[PDB]
């Protein structure tokens, strides 16, 4: 078993392992498009001699963190071990090599979407966003008197064919991803892929439509088997008015019984209706996972809540060093120290705090975060909270 | 149709309307026990002449709010309109009369559990706690290395018959309800009712067992139809160690496939496992609803986050007056003013903010809360947040 | 943690652990009746000091093995570890103590029914009978021209109330259990229990009826929820005519769509119909598990197939000694030797061969049985086969 | 209604009846390939005058029987009566004509797969193999310490694309079918068909993969609707090591919850796991059906168990003659006699005994086999048993 960067000849073998590992495998054509996001030396393979029994790679991404700061992010993807080669340490070896290359290349953070919840914790990835599925029984849904855009006169929303308004979707998404923690820059090849998936497939997905507002869009399709369910694949709204206008249009889909969307826990939709309970939480899961590669670069890069006064502490990450951490006026300074630790946690836990999806108090109650000072806990909770709620951009 | 306080002769008629209105109707014997919590003049009935076509009442409760402050609370319950008398304004008339008596009696807050999500908003009740069902597939569940009580030697938890340890359950619950926002004082008659429901019923619920720790208990029973599901009716833990010790015992129920509990969104259970995803969110609903009866008494009574600096604003409640609100050092002063409003909201919205379950920012994005100052929003969010996560005590 | 024989005072604590461990817990009254089958020193408990955190016991049973030989059998039952005390070696300690007492008392075999398939292998128990559920869609079922009892004139079968023909059921079962491998002697207290379970229970099982023939009976009841399914709890037939006559009567239950029974893989029922496929296998599971306590006493006690010629080999049981085994004229002699082993297997594997339910060839193909001689395999398969197919008597 | 051999002009009409009769109809292209296995005069049609209202044919196959003996076998297939022409005796007439041609041509046995269990018994076909579906919950599956290939170092199994290793699959299958009773020689055109079905179909089956060992292969695909189920279409292992190595690889499919396979009752898979119960029997059905065309040629052709001593009897087949049958040293002689019958049975029953899937004792208990001598029964059971368990090759 030898771990080396993959040659051009290995890609057919890598595509075979992919096809056998990923039931949602996007196909060799789509794989070749995402692969334009993989840098030179961004991929490893394990060869049994000979054939590919293991692979892993990272893509060059840009991730928005609290304070509207954009970090270079290594997005791990296409991770597979052959069913013939389990329990041989191949995933551990591939992750150690990519982490070395990611850290040497200067990335402050790595990120992934997890096939299972029990694998990536031990390599330092913490779940950092929360997927929340809402299903609305739109036959009962009535908008609250307070909800925006209840006035008479033309709708600001249009029903359109996605492929004919690419420019407008691109510009609205660019504005969205720069203002929301969890936002990811979407390159042209991923717009090519998204618009190609919006066509109907024989014996597959039905056609996608769009609802378009100057400051937001929704892409939706009727479910392939449940013909009374519309699934919203993506709703991106830059203003509260755009969000409300798009939901009025979706609740106007009078053919449907139910509208479902994978959104975030702080989605205001329920509060737009006279019955908040009509927006039912039907599913909840970890979304994006983060590994903080450089503790001080990551902690100094993001913005913090202005509402907490200046404080200083000492944070130890279990294998990531010990730092004097001073947070004031929305900014952190994070410098080496050998002074006694006031807070300890594993690296994964810092990833789970980093975008504001998990409270320090909640992690402390599980003993994943350790301090003897409950005032310091309250200050950490307040400082790491995100003013703009964390959202999940798109899977990779 | 006449609305009057019910006489002794009306209770059989009220029990008939109850039996026909509530499929979960607790029965005349249990009804007579809860009724010891109803004060003189705490009940109204509507008579068609003659017979009972409408009823409503409140109980004298004690509700813990952020800062460990206990408020006298009017708990509305036993609310029913006859199926013969819909759309005649009976619920509106009964709620106006009880609200008048509740306000004249000096209660700062009223509370209820809602049969439907669309009814109580218009009478000024806002959903103020969130029920979160977690289902654990305990066959995969392994505790994280960091989780407390992983050491060898005797368990601190005992499997017991609930009826033989009443005193210990009472003392642990009393400690729990005083330290948690949403806590309700549980009177002796409700302990009599709880321990009576823990016996098996022929063709009904199976026997309840308890897991007992010095600082917490869990009551559980096997589901009547799904024999591989244990339902935890109630887990009350005063320390993180008690919470972890009780979950180790519940995951030791090797006969079961699944353990379910109705808990709160900040339950640390997921963080205790190596796979956070095993603790699946299977259901989410409003729990306790609050109506703020006296805005200034309620706002001054609760404690606020110490992490936000002193600030002053003007809050208008749509039919509840306008107040100069100054929040500093964890305390509010809330005094009459005719100065221009900086924040407006309906009374229900204030109930939804009051225990920290809903962010002002989330309600503002739905236009349920209106201000032109985004800094004031951030300050309100931070100040109304609860250090101790809001929990739901018991339905009424 | 101390392991000791249980005192009279411990039984309430043992009944509490039982109630919490066994959803099918038969209740304190029934427990007290089965307990008349437990000998002095047949039970162990583990006390945390104080309270019962572990228990296990054996009953005195009589088990029929091939050749119509009846062995004294220790039937393990009522085995439970408290959910508070998992992963502390309590089951291993309780099984070692009972096995010591069972071996010192002179039992050649122990037996149990397994709550799960992965626990008892490591203590030397092998699955030794196979439960096979057949479901017949009786609306299509027609008897083959060859099937016995197709003649005109009175039926030999009567529909009766079980409690009014106890004597006849007892005598037919006594004849059945002595002629079938897997048969268990059923004592009077277990007839008291069986006839008590045949009454309807409010919100529970419906009434049981019997079909009675001079040489067989069936006990059946309509399923509590599926009102078109009759479940046969027990069919005991001493002759092929009794078996066919009883199935003609069961297929005469014209109210039902389906008849189900838990039987054995060699049940001739399918061959009685013109469409063998109507007798559908809906479920298959291990039934009785055996631990051979004394290899030579067990191997010499049972009869062997007369169709295989005399042969000699050397059998090693992994921690059970090495024996010269000579099988001829349906009889084995099994004597100590230090000569080289020709066959090796763990003790559990010998239990799985002992009643003829599993072929040596099948176990050899899994490498659970090891020999270099394929002729010896064929001879072992032929010699351990049972002329009378193995059946499962009743759970304990 | 006239029964005649079909002309070239009739095939479109035969393809129309096929399309309307067989929901699994393989299509005209595939039909044309299987048709290369039909001899001149191997097909009959019934014409209403005019159009095809009935058809039936046989293919030239080679069937392995106990003793590794290969018989020429007439494989009936493509049997259909028009829904317009039921209850007119068309199937009986078509089967009598083909049976005449099959017997005159010199075939000792005919075979088929039955659409229903109640049709072919009366034409002399007995079910002769048993399909057994095992479903493994691979998330719990752990291999027993005794299981082969538990050592460290390279796997002997490779994940491959089926179409790129045709030669290796062909050679492994050829070795398998010659050593296993029920094996069928697979001609080149059926390899062309098998490899064509391994490609993904739009709105149809997903892509098939292979696991390849020097001495075995498995072909599997993810189920089209249940994305956590892998279905093994075919596993052919010549050694126990190949069988164990392939199952280790299949249980390494970490994306799946369940692996299912249609195998035989003696599959050793359950015995490879620490929990035998994880390999659940989810379905059981007759597989291949046999009609013995020439009793003496069939009885003398197959090998018998060497473990039973020489014996002689007289067997009468109900319309198939009476024979002196002498079985000794694994060989039978079967000669005409008018001596009194000691064993009687219909022709279908002999087909059910012929490959060892059904015991004579089991058929005797249903009175499908009649003798007054229970010693002769035991000898027949032992002699007709197959050392190598009967498997089902492929449907036709
Ligand atoms: N989990 C489905 C999903 C969704 C989107 C992208 C995706 O693969 C990304 C990817 C594929 C191939 C390569 Cl070379 C690099 C990256 C998978
Ligand atoms: N929703 C079920 C439920 C649960 C607990 C109490 C309950 O009724 C409370 C109550 C009943 C009767 C009276 Cl006079 C006063 C109060 C209903
Ligand atoms: N698994 C259900 C079942 C069925 C029959 C008997 C049974 O317990 C047997 C038993 C119970 C109590 C005692 Cl002291 C001794 C033996 C359990
Ligand atoms: N039952 C499905 C199935 C599976 C495989 C073959 C098959 O038809 C075989 C066949 C088809 C056409 C002809 Cl001319 C001859 C033979 C049917």
UniProtKB/Swiss-Prot annotation, chains A, B, C, D:
Signal peptide range: none
The catalytic activity of this protein is classed by the Enzyme Commission as 2.3.1.-
Q: From what superkingdom does this record's organism come?
A: Bacteria
Matching entries from Pfam families are given as: Acetyltransf_17 (PF17668), Acetyltransf_9 (PF13527), SCP2_2 (PF13530)
Which residues act catalytically here? 120, 396
Q: Enumerate the NCBIfam families for this protein.
A: PRK01346.1-1 (NF002364), PRK01346.1-4 (NF002367)
Question: What is the protein name stated in its UniProt record?
Answer: N-acetyltransferase Eis
Gene designation per UniProt: eis
């Amino acid at each position: 078993v030898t771990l080396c960067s993959p040659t051009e000849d290995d890609w057919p073998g890598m595509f075979l392992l992919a096809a056998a590992s990923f039931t949602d495998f996007i196909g060799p054509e789509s794989a070749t498009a995402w692969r334009t996001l993989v840098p030179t030396d961004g991929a490893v393979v394990v060869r049994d001699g000979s054939e590919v029994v293991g692979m892993a790679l990272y893509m060059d991404l840009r991730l928005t963190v609290p304070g509207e700061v954009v970090l270079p992010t290594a997005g791990l993807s296409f991770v597979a071990v052959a069913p013939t080669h389990r329990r041989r340490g191949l995933l551990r070896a591939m992750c150690a090599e990519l982490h070395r290359r990611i850290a040497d290349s200067g990335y402050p953070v790595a990120a992934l979407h997890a096939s299972e919840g029990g694998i990536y914790g031990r390599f330092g990835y913490g779940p950092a966003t929360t997927l929340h599925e809402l299903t609305v029984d739109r036959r009962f849904a009535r908008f609250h008197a307070d909800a925006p855009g209840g006035g008479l006169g033309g709708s600001s929303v249009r029903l359109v064919r996605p492929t004919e308004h690419r420019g407008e979707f691109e510009a609205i998404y660019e504005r969205w991803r720069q203002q929301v923690p969890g936002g990811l820059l979407r390159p042209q090849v991923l717009w090519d892929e998204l618009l190609a998936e919006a066509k109907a497939a024989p014996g597959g997905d039905r056609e996608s439509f769009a609802l378009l507002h100057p400051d937001g869009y929704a892409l939706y399709r009727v479910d392939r088997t449940d013909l009374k369910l519309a699934r919203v694949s993506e709703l991106r709204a830059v203003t509260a008015d755009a969000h409300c206008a798009l939901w009025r249009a979706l609740i106007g889909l009078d053919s449907m019984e139910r509208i479902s969307i994978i959104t975030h826990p702080q989605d205001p939709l329920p509060h737009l209706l006279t019955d908040t309970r009509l927006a039912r939480t039907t599913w909840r899961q970890d979304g994006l996972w983060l590994r903080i590669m450089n503790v001080p670069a990551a902690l100094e890069a993001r913005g913090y809540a202005h509402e907490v006064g200046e404080f200083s502490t000492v944070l130890e990450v279990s294998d990531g060093g010990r730092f004097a951490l001073k947070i004031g006026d929305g900014r952190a300074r994070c410098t080496p120290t050998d002074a006694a630790a006031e807070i300890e946690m594993d690296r994964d836990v810092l990833g789970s705090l980093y975008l504001g999806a998990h409270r320090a108090s909640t992690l402390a109650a599980a003993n994943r975060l350790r301090t003897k000072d409950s005032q310091l806990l309250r200050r950490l909770d307040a400082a790491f909270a995100s003013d703009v709620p964390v959202q999940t951009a798109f899977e990779f």
